[PDB]
Amino acid sequence: ESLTGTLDAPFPEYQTLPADPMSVLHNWLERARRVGIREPRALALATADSQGRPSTRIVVISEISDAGVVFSTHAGSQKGRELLHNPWASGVLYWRETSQQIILNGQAVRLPNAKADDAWLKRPYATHPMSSVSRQSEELQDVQAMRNAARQLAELQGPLPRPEGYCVFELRLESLEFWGNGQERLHERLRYDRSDTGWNVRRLQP
Amino acid sequence: GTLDAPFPEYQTLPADPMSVLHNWLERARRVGIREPRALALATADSQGRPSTRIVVISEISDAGVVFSTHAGSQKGRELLHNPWASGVLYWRETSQQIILNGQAVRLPNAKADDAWLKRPYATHPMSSVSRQSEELQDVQAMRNAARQLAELQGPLPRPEGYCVFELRLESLEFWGNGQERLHERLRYDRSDTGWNVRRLQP
Numbered sequence: 065e066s067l068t069g070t071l072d073a074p075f076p077e078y079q080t081l082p083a084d085p086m087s088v089l090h091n092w093l094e095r096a097r098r099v100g101i102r103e104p105r106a107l108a109l110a111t112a113d114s115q116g117r118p119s120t121r122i123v124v125i126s127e128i129s130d131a132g133v134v135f136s137t138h139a140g141s142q143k144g145r146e147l148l149h150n151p152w153a154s155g156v157l158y159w160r161e162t163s164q165q166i167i168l169n170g171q172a173v174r175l176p177n178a179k180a181d182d183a184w185l186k187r188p189y190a191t192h193p194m195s196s197v198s199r200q201s202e203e204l205q206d207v208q209a210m211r212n213a214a215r216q217l218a219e220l221q222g223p224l225p226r227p228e229g230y231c232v233f234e235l236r237l238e239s240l241e242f243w244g245n246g247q248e249r250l251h252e253r254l255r256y257d258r259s260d261t262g263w264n265v266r267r268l269q270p
Numbered sequence: 271g272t273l274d275a276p277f278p279e280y281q282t283l284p285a286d287p288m289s290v291l292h293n294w295l296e297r298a299r300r301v302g303i304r305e306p307r308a309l310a311l312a313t314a315d316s317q318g319r320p321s322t323r324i325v326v327i328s329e330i331s332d333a334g335v336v337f338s339t340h341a342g343s344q345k346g347r348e349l350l351h352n353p354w355a356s357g358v359l360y361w362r363e364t365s366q367q368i369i370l371n372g373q374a375v376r377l378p379n380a381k382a383d384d385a386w387l388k389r390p391y392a393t394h395p396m397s398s399v400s401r402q403s404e405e406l407q408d409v410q411a412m413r414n415a416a417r418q419l420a421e422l423q424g425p426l427p428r429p430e431g432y433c434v435f436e437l438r439l440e441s442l443e444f445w446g447n448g449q450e451r452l453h454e455r456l457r458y459d460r461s462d463t464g465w466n467v468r469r470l471q472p
């Protein structure tokens with residue numbers, strides 16, 4: 065048996081079926097914060113290429129919005145190029161300590177540059193030199209050249225201008241699943257799908 | 271980044287990424303990474319809309335990695351029509367990722383029989399009663415049916431639809447945190463004659 069979690073993970077929502085899934089997302093994230101889950105917002109984000117072939121990587125959720133979740137990246141990266149052509153994405157959060165997963169499905173929209181400017185400035189300025197010199201996901205020809213270039217920019221010891229491709233995406237949710245380990249291996253799966261008006265909610269078989 | 275995280279392959283560029291994969295996984299076991307084989311597996315539907323969930327890598331093979339699931343689940347239904355998949359392993363303790371891309375194919379029933387028999391028998395009742403990912407209409411009914419099966423000794427028969435997939439790899443990336451935020455990305459792509467390797471910008 066592979067699951068190692070041992071912390072109590074209350075899931076009254078599996079019984080009560082709240083109409084509004086963002087409240088469940090807020091409840092779970094707040095509890096994760098309060099009990100000290102390690103890196104709860106590390107999202108395994110999937111995008112797909114022009115033929116529907118998926119790719120994955122970790123990104124951090126920086127904000128929970130009314131419509132979904134927000135993250136930052138580089139537009140020229142693989143995920144950025146894939147999202148520009150096909151906005152559909154899915155990500156999964158998994159918390160080993162409580163044996164909980166959260167699956168988040170929807171369409172990711174690039175937010176305005178004013179939003180990216182604010183997000184860039186909110187990052188610690190020590191992150192700016194490498195994020196400026198790097199063209200994320202292109203081939204790296206000379207490690208030492210990139211290192212030396214970033215070191216020269218870092219001399220400023222303060223904020224740099226936002227690089228053109230640094231962007232913020234909002235994943236506007238169309239469906240969500242909250243998964244808990246449950247009792248007697250009857251894993252508790254609470255599934256939401258957007259309706260014309262609000263959400264439909266269902267339990268799924270484990 | 272609480273545990274040592276060596277990445278000498280970023281300097282030496284080993285030819286065979288499957289050897290690198292073996293070595294990273296063995297090191298993760300030795301140093302005590304928590305649930306290192308918890309793979310965030312992405313599939314996509316006929317419109318190209320991805321879906322994700324965690325599955326456990328059960329074995330490494332010559333061509334890739336192996337996991338089990340139910341054919342009628344969402345991932346199983348998506349893979350039936352679109353075999354392309356990707357998964358990521360992420361180890362918080364060492365700040366490392368492994369990204370695995372390729373085509374996931376269903377193995378024969380004798381392989382599924384063996385995988386099913388190798389599970390702890392306590393897992394057999396619920397996995398037999400459930401039709402994974404279909405709507406659950408009556409929680410208590412499922413619970414009670416599984417409890418009847420849990421009274422039995424030994425293994426149960428393998429259910430219709432319990433299956434094993436092999437994710438036959440076409441590309442891999444090994445990611446480490448590096449120094450001075452120059453995150454270290456080692457990318458492999460299969461060729462006609464072997465594998466090509468490159469470093470990627472962070």
Ligand SMILES: Cc1cc2nc3c(=O)[nH]c(=O)nc-3n(C[C@H](O)[C@H](O)[C@H](O)COP(=O)(O)O)c2cc1C
Pocket residue numbers: 124125126136137138365453
């Ligand atoms: C482009 C980009 C790259 C990032 N890379 C890493 C990383 O390589 N390793 C890591 O632990 N966090 C990484 N992060 C996440 C940040 O460290 C941070 O956790 C997140 O962006 C927001 O942090 P906060 O809302 O908790 O303050 C990255 C964030 C961005 C936007």
Ligand SMILES: Cc1cc2nc3c(=O)[nH]c(=O)nc-3n(C[C@H](O)[C@H](O)[C@H](O)COP(=O)(O)O)c2cc1C
Pocket residue numbers: 106119120121122123124125135136137138141142143144200201365366367445472
């Ligand atoms: C813990 C952690 C957090 C990360 N957070 C981000 C992030 O928020 N944004 C980002 O662009 N990359 C982040 N990264 C780096 C990505 O995993 C990935 O290497 C990069 O975005 C390129 O992905 P792509 O080539 O698939 O587009 C993070 C990596 C780690 C290990």
Ligand SMILES: Cc1cc2nc3c(=O)[nH]c(=O)nc-3n(C[C@H](O)[C@H](O)[C@H](O)COP(=O)(O)O)c2cc1C
Pocket residue numbers: 067158163164165243270308321322323324325326327337338339340343344345346402403
């Ligand atoms: C840590 C962990 C490991 C899991 N391992 C598997 C697995 O190996 N196979 C499987 O079918 N489901 C596994 N599950 C359940 C899946 O995440 C998911 O609920 C189920 O496979 C249905 O996914 P789908 O509806 O997207 O097809 C695991 C869940 C967790 C939290």
